[PDB]
Enzyme design. Structure first.
Site, PDB file in Angstrom:
ATOM      1  N   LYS A  17       0.813  -1.210   0.000  1.00  0.00           N
ATOM      2  CA  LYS A  17       0.000   0.000   0.000  1.00  0.00           C
ATOM      3  C   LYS A  17       0.852   1.268   0.000  1.00  0.00           C
ATOM      4  O   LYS A  17       0.700   2.122  -0.872  1.00  0.00           O
ATOM      5  CB  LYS A  17      -0.942   0.004   1.207  1.00  0.00           C
ATOM      6  N   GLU A  85      16.616  -6.306   7.077  1.00  0.00           N
ATOM      7  CA  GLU A  85      17.177  -7.649   6.984  1.00  0.00           C
ATOM      8  C   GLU A  85      16.373  -8.506   6.024  1.00  0.00           C
ATOM      9  O   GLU A  85      15.156  -8.355   5.914  1.00  0.00           O
ATOM     10  CB  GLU A  85      17.217  -8.311   8.363  1.00  0.00           C
ATOM     11  N   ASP A 130      -0.346  -4.831  16.174  1.00  0.00           N
ATOM     12  CA  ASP A 130      -0.286  -5.142  14.745  1.00  0.00           C
ATOM     13  C   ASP A 130       0.251  -6.545  14.453  1.00  0.00           C
ATOM     14  O   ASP A 130      -0.037  -7.117  13.404  1.00  0.00           O
ATOM     15  CB  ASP A 130       0.579  -4.100  14.027  1.00  0.00           C
ATOM     16  N   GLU A 134       0.887 -11.642   8.734  1.00  0.00           N
ATOM     17  CA  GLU A 134       1.353 -10.832   7.619  1.00  0.00           C
ATOM     18  C   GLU A 134       2.620 -10.073   8.000  1.00  0.00           C
ATOM     19  O   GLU A 134       3.314  -9.530   7.140  1.00  0.00           O
ATOM     20  CB  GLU A 134       0.263  -9.860   7.176  1.00  0.00           C
ATOM     21  N   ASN A 135       2.915 -10.049   9.296  1.00  0.00           N
ATOM     22  CA  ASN A 135       4.071  -9.329   9.818  1.00  0.00           C
ATOM     23  C   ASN A 135       5.142 -10.247  10.397  1.00  0.00           C
ATOM     24  O   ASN A 135       5.964  -9.812  11.201  1.00  0.00           O
ATOM     25  CB  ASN A 135       3.634  -8.336  10.897  1.00  0.00           C
TER      26      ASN A 135
HETATM   27  C1  LIG Z   1       7.811 -18.055  -0.547  1.00  0.00           C
HETATM   28  C2  LIG Z   1       8.904 -17.575  -0.516  1.00  0.00           C
HETATM   29  C3  LIG Z   1      10.295 -16.958  -0.495  1.00  0.00           C
HETATM   30  N1  LIG Z   1      10.307 -15.690   0.184  1.00  0.00           N
HETATM   31  C4  LIG Z   1       9.315 -14.689  -0.100  1.00  0.00           C
HETATM   32  O1  LIG Z   1       8.435 -14.889  -0.930  1.00  0.00           O
HETATM   33  C5  LIG Z   1       9.357 -13.329   0.617  1.00  0.00           C
HETATM   34  C6  LIG Z   1      10.603 -12.873   1.302  1.00  0.00           C
HETATM   35  C7  LIG Z   1      10.673 -11.686   1.900  1.00  0.00           C
HETATM   36  N2  LIG Z   1      11.901 -11.299   2.547  1.00  0.00           N
HETATM   37  C8  LIG Z   1      11.969 -10.140   3.399  1.00  0.00           C
HETATM   38  C9  LIG Z   1      11.213  -8.949   3.276  1.00  0.00           C
HETATM   39  C10 LIG Z   1      11.585  -8.089   4.284  1.00  0.00           C
HETATM   40  C11 LIG Z   1      11.013  -6.554   4.609  1.00  0.00           C
HETATM   41  C12 LIG Z   1      10.467  -6.501   5.832  1.00  0.00           C
HETATM   42  C13 LIG Z   1       9.895  -6.220   3.944  1.00  0.00           C
HETATM   43  N3  LIG Z   1      12.579  -8.729   5.040  1.00  0.00           N
HETATM   44  N4  LIG Z   1      12.808  -9.998   4.484  1.00  0.00           N
HETATM   45  N5  LIG Z   1       9.530 -10.824   1.880  1.00  0.00           N
HETATM   46  C14 LIG Z   1       8.403 -11.224   1.258  1.00  0.00           C
HETATM   47  N6  LIG Z   1       7.279 -10.345   1.249  1.00  0.00           N
HETATM   48  C15 LIG Z   1       7.322  -9.235   2.169  1.00  0.00           C
HETATM   49  C16 LIG Z   1       6.420  -8.085   1.727  1.00  0.00           C
HETATM   50  N7  LIG Z   1       5.158  -8.563   1.245  1.00  0.00           N
HETATM   51  C17 LIG Z   1       4.009  -7.678   1.238  1.00  0.00           C
HETATM   52  O2  LIG Z   1       2.938  -8.102   0.816  1.00  0.00           O
HETATM   53  C18 LIG Z   1       4.098  -6.220   1.740  1.00  0.00           C
HETATM   54  C19 LIG Z   1       4.089  -5.998   3.237  1.00  0.00           C
HETATM   55  C20 LIG Z   1       4.145  -4.731   3.734  1.00  0.00           C
HETATM   56  C21 LIG Z   1       4.221  -3.504   2.825  1.00  0.00           C
HETATM   57  O3  LIG Z   1       4.281  -2.193   3.419  1.00  0.00           O
HETATM   58  S1  LIG Z   1       4.952  -1.002   2.737  1.00  0.00           S
HETATM   59  O4  LIG Z   1       4.450   0.286   3.354  1.00  0.00           O
HETATM   60  O5  LIG Z   1       4.620  -0.775   1.280  1.00  0.00           O
HETATM   61  C22 LIG Z   1       4.224  -3.722   1.475  1.00  0.00           C
HETATM   62  C23 LIG Z   1       4.164  -5.149   0.905  1.00  0.00           C
HETATM   63  C24 LIG Z   1       4.930  -9.894   0.757  1.00  0.00           C
HETATM   64  C25 LIG Z   1       6.199 -10.626   0.344  1.00  0.00           C
HETATM   65  N8  LIG Z   1       8.319 -12.525   0.600  1.00  0.00           N
END
Ligand SMILES: C#CCNC(=O)c1cc(Nc2cc(C3CC3)[nH]n2)nc(N2CCN(C(=O)c3ccc(O[S+](=O)=O)cc3)CC2)n1
Length: 252
Positions: A17, A85, A130, A134-135
């Protein structure tokens, strides 16, 4: 101290978002980290400019194997960037959609890594909300790691009674989240789900939930002890790591 030109962005991790999060390597020496871009838009659409600006202030002063790191940040003319990270194995919400519902071994371990992280957060004087699937990211070894913390309205599903009643709240809030989470891991859905606020608000306010047949005693006794209306009678996380069902199924 950082800028967009010390980094090489790669595979898009998530499009959300307030911005996008990408896989990025610090070109200085090739470090793998997650880099989240928050544009001034959306962020300046709300007054969260300094709302989640103190959240980053809390994030940095936070080091834990079960707490996602915040290495730094910097400002662009259009957006702001967060150096985070990298969690190799995505979120718990993703793993929860693929497995639908967790067992007792996996769940007991998740609330263990969570109790530790929350305990450290309270000892460091940090109140959290929160906290939801999802977190929660998984590390290389599946190490649970909590994220966001910008909240340190939306779906009330994970909010405690005292918070939605507009009343007072303290450290005992995180022990309501521990209860809602443990239920969702075991069942697949939050214990106060619905289709509206007004219903969820009522259900969360009355603390009205039921148990599927399979969810066992010891798990019921823990979700029950954890989900009491009054902020007291909820065990301090020191006592939650001690629970027989927890220890009889957890890992360490
Ligand atoms: C299966 C498999 C293999 N790994 C992944 O598929 C995989 C690995 C990863 N590694 C990470 C990310 C982080 C950061 C703290 C992000 N650390 N390590 N992250 C994600 N994700 C995170 C984010 N995702 C969301 O949907 C989102 C959430 C908030 C958000 O807020 S922001 O203000 O825009 C905007 C998007 C969805 C996929 N997915």
């Amino acid at each position: 101290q950082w800028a967009l030109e010390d980094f090489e962005i790669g595979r898009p991790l998530g499009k959300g978002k307030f911005g996008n999060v990408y896989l990025a390597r610090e070109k200085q020496s090739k470090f793998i980290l997650a880099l989240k871009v928050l544009f001034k838009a959306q962020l300046e659409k709300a007054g969260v400019e300094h709302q989640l600006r103190r959240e980053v202030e809390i994030q940095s002063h936070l080091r834990h194997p079960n707490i996602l790191r915040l290495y730094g940040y910097f400002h662009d003319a259009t957006r702001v960037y967060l150096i985070l990270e990298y969690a190799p194995l995505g979120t718990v919400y993703r793993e929860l959609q693929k497995l639908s519902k967790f067992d007792e071994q996996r769940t007991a371990t998740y609330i263990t890594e969570l109790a530790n992280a929350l305990s450290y957060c309270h000892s460091k004087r940090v109140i959290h909300r929160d906290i939801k699937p999802e977190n929660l990211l998984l590390g290389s070894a599946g190490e649970l790691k909590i994220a966001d913390f910008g909240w340190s309205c939306g779906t009330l599903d994970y909010l405690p009674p005292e918070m939605i009643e507009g009343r007072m709240h303290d450290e005992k809030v995180d022990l309501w989240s521990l209860g809602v989470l443990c239920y969702e891991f075991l069942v697949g859905k939050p214990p106060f789900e619905a289709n509206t606020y007004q219903e969820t608000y009522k259900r969360i306010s009355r603390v009205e939930f039921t148990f599927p047949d399979f969810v066992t005693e010891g798990a019921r006794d823990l979700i029950s002890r954890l989900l009491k209306h009054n902020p007291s009678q909820r065990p301090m996380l020191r006592e939650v790591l001690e629970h027989p069902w927890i220890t009889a199924n957890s890992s360490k």
